[PDB]
Amino acid sequence: KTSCPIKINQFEGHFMKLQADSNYLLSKEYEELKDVGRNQSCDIALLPENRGKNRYNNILPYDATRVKLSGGSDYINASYIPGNNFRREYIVTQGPLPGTKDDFWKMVWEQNVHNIVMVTQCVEKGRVKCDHYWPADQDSLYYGDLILQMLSESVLPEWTIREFKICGEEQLDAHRLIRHFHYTVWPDHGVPETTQSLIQFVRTVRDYINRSPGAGPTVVHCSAGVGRTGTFIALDRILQQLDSKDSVDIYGAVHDLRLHRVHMVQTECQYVYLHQCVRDVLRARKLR
Ligand SMILES: CCOC(=O)C(CCNC(=O)OC(C)(C)C)(Cc1ccc(NS(=O)(=O)O)cc1)C(=O)OCC
Ligand SMILES: [Cl-]
Ligand SMILES: [Cl-]
Ligand SMILES: [Mg+2]
Ligand SMILES: [Mg+2]
């Protein structure tokens, strides 16, 4: 299986069948995804000199899809995800470490990123999951050769939107505005409390992207840059399918992400959640 399309008019019943006998068919599907993509090298990532640049030593970018930094140490734990129409729709990455904050912002600048989506908290169940890689207050900071200033921070019920200005130090006139969307209510290895919340967050970000008169790739990260990051991007793609086609292909969406990075949609619960979001959108639409 590379794809399992479901006609939208059949989705409700198909989902009930997938859930039958304690999610038997859903589990069978999820398990079929287990080895997708795994026939690719993680060689550059496994170099001793790059070891300390990886948050989790099992979660490494493939050579064929890794993002390269300019200059003499080109390594960051980050992977390009191609779009349906053109390469590099997203860059998926881990939560930056103290020693990779500069690399993260260097990647942002070099790849012409204008929007960042963060789907982890910095600290969860008492563990650091992502370092606090932007300024704490309103003062400018250098991160390597870039200057970063926070312009606004808008705390909303379930996510916070921040705007930053970033300048290359050699050309202070040529700044860029970066928007950062931080979803604050998603437990690691788990799912948000409602489908409605993540659906609206994804639609919100998608609307902002669509007004970012084409930017570069959207960066999406969590702690490892696979579970919550993968579920987010999967839901973005699936919601676009529901707006364009009369079939939806959740298996194909996750399959295609796994071709580009390990563990995208990292738990069966997350895979089930994607089905619940589709179910919920379609239920509403049936009556409207
Ligand atoms: C380096 C080895 O680490 C792993 O294998 C991780 C983390 C395991 N640790 C963990 O969950 O700790 C607490 C339960 C106390 C929070 C690496 C990891 C960490 C977080 C995620 N979620 S994501 O941030 O949503 O990607 C995914 C993988 C793992 O579970 O791998 C699964 C393939
Ligand atoms: Cl790509
Ligand atoms: Cl695209
Ligand atoms: Mg370095
Ligand atoms: Mg520094």
CB 227 near ligand 1, within 6 Å: yes
| Domain 1-288 CATH superfamily | Protein tyrosine phosphatase superfamily (3.90.190.10)
CB 120 near ligand 1, within 6 Å: yes
> Can you tell me which atom of ligand 1 is nearest the CA of 186?
25
CB 125 near ligand 1, within 6 Å: yes
- 222 is known as an active-site residue: yes
Q: How far apart are CA 207 and CA 211, in angstroms?
A: 7
3-state SS of the chain? CCCCCEEHHHHHHHHHHHHHHHHHHHHHHHHHCCCCCCCCCCHHHHCHHHHHHCCCCCCCCCCCCEEECCCCCCEEEEEEECCCCCCCCEEEECCCCCCCHHHHHHHHHHCCCCEEEECCCCEECCEECCCCCCCCCCCCEEECCEEEEEEEEEECCCEEEEEEEEEECCEEEEEEEEEEEEECCCCCCCCCCCHHHHHHHHHHHHHHHHCCCCCCCEEEECCCCCHHHHHHHHHHHHHHHHHHCCEECHHHHHHHHHCCCCCCCCCHHHHHHHHHHHHHHHHHHHCC
Domain boundaries defined on the chain: 1-288
Bridge partners for 115 per DSSP: 179
> Can you tell me which atom of ligand 1 is nearest the CA of 189?
22
Give the residue, by CA position, lying nearest to ligand 1 atom 28: 224
Q: Which ligand is nearest to the CA of 262?
A: 1
Q: Phi-psi category of 202—alpha, beta or left, where left has phi over 0 and alpha has psi -120 to 50?
A: alpha
Cα angle: 70, vertex 76, 79; to 5 degrees? 100
Ion ligand 2 — residues with CB < 5 Å? 80, 82, 87-88
